[PDB]
Amino acid sequence: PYYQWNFAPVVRGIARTQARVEVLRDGYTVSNELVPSGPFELANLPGSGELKVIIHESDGTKQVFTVPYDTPAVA
Amino acid sequence: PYYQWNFAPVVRGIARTQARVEVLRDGYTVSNELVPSGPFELANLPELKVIIHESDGTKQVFTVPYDTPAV
Ligand SMILES: [Cl-]
Hints:
Two copies of one chain form a homodimer.
Chain A: E1 2-4, E2 7-15, E3 19-24, E4 29-35, E5 38-42, E6 49-56, E7 62-69
Antiparallel strand pairs in A: 2-5, 3-4, 3-6, 6-7
The complex binds chloride ion (CL).
Protein name (chain B): F1 capsule-anchoring protein
Subcellular location (chain B): Cell outer membrane
Family (chain B): Belongs to the fimbrial export usher family.
């Protein structure tokens, strides 16, 4: 049994109210997590390209962002 | 919002039967869970002491060294 160095990808941000954070790829919804207000960290996600992150807030407001992603080469 | 890569190390090993694996980080119990026979990974953990109790009642204690890269 051994200790292994792994690197997991996450997307971090801030939610205004307590919200639903949706992660889209190419139109396809991949993540969907309800979070408390403030900072959030989204584990479990799908190379390189772009994600779309919508923060559906309690009052019906949608904070929409484009999140560029990339997988780094490791020796 | 931004994409980022977190250092997320794991303790890997092979359990012969449906086992219980306990991981100690210097005295404190850090992980204790039941695993099926075959390979196992232990994620999201707060030298390590890894104890593998197996179905037949046999137990082995391993000293697994751990390190964190400097950034
Ligand atoms: Cl929508």
